[PDB]
């Protein structure tokens, strides 16, 4: 996004500028369920632009840059990565599991982490897998408001489970073994 905003006349190269672009992205960007058609109009008219107030009183608007940024999730080649996107990797993780597993993973595609908060991501990912998946199978995405905070929440859940109280390394075992103990006791 910083490089494409530079293309539009908004060059952000220092730390304050970088932190600001991240904030702009979080509030203005979306994935688009059809990149090329969305771009055809975003690149042609101000009607698909959204404004943002910069901290110094200046303003910026974002056009196709608004969706081209998250598009890298579907097209990693945008940043120089040799990859077909997060939906191909999701597809392969389902496909590479045993044949009696595949049906359950297709129906339980879980979005987690941040960036899951770009509008349309929960739906585009179901579309992209459905397009690769066999027919008959149900493809479904799980995308709760507990998105981006799901790892922390999982930590809270796990730390407090009765089924997890035997998984903790105590500060006894730790000193006898040293920190390498984590590879035997945790994961």
């Amino acid at each position: 996004l910083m490089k494409i905003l530079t293309e539009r006349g908004y060059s952000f190269v220092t730390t304050a500028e970088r932190e600001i672009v991240r904030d702009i992205k979080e509030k203005l960007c979306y994935v688009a369920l059809d990149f090329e058609n969305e771009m055809a109009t975003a690149a042609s008219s101000s009607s698909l632009e959204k404004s943002y107030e910069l901290p110094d009183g200046q303003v910026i608007t974002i056009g196709n840059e608004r969706f081209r940024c998250p598009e890298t999730l579907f097209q990693p080649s945008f940043i120089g990565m040799e990859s077909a996107g997060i939906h191909e990797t999701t597809y392969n993780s389902i496909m590479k599991c045993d044949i009696d597993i595949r049906k359950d993973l297709y129906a339980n595609n879980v979005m987690s982490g941040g960036t899951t908060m770009y509008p349309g991501i929960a739906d585009r990912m179901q579309k992209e897998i459905t397009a690769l998946a066999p027919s008959t199978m149900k493809i479904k995405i799980i995308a709760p408001p507990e998105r981006k905070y799901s790892v922390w929440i999982g930590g809270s859940i796990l730390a407090s489970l009765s089924t997890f109280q035997q998984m903790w390394i105590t500060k006894q075992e730790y000193d006898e073994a040293g920190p390498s103990i984590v590879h035997r006791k945790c994961f």
Binding site: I153, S156, I157, S160
Partner: protein, 56 residues
């Protein structure tokens, strides 16, 4: 001339209908394993609110 073939027919029908009978006995005394079950469902009819647990 009429009694001997009659007796032979009685013996043959006895053996065949009797194997039929001993197996039909097992069929009739127990017709429970050939039944079925209701298989009810809970279905979680509460799509108006959520749960208390930390995982929810």
């Amino acid at each position: 001339m009429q009694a001997l073939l009659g007796a032979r027919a009685k013996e043959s029908l006895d053996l065949r209908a009797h194997l039929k009978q001993v197996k039909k006995e097992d069929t009739e005394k127990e017709n429970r394993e050939v039944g079925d079950w209701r298989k009810n469902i809970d279905a979680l009819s509460g799509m108006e609110g959520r749960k208390k647990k930390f995982e929810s």
